[PDB]
Target: Dehaloperoxidase A
Amino acid sequence: GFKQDIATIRGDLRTYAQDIFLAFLNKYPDERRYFKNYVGKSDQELKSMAKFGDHTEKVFNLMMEVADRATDSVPLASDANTLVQMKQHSSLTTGNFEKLFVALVEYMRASGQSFDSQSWDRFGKNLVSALSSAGMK
Ligand code: HEM
Ligand SMILES: [C-]#N
Model:
């Protein structure tokens, strides 16, 4: 289930973080614009760039912490607030997060590894709701 999926992702955090983030950028190329230093780089080029690995690792570590603190895939109000109030997320709207979770769910469904993809879709939905309420446009 969802708790096991957190363990699966954490077990190989850098690999999953990189592969899911790339699936996101590749499904929604307009999103790459927000990450000026990943512009003009192939998947393998990014996998060799230390800063890409560090970014994705930090993002997915935080995502997994928010997931782990959730109850029944409903994230904490404080965690949603953290994501909204982060200076790095000042320009974002909930659609940016929607796209990340659509790509993440698509990745999980296409994977040979078992995932509770339905629960991640619902987690994403619940996170988007919590982000909106916390002030995200
Ligand atoms: C639940 C989902 C998300 C989590 C947990 C998250 C988490 C984080 C974390 C921990 C950082 C700082 C990491 C570092 O030091 O590099 C960061 C930075 C950033 N995030 Fe997110 N993020 C999420 C979604 C998004 C989305 C959907 C976008 C836009 C499409 C976005 C845009 C950015 C940008 C532009 C930065 C700054 C990167 C830089 O320093 O160049 N984030 N995020
Ligand atoms: C940042 N994702």
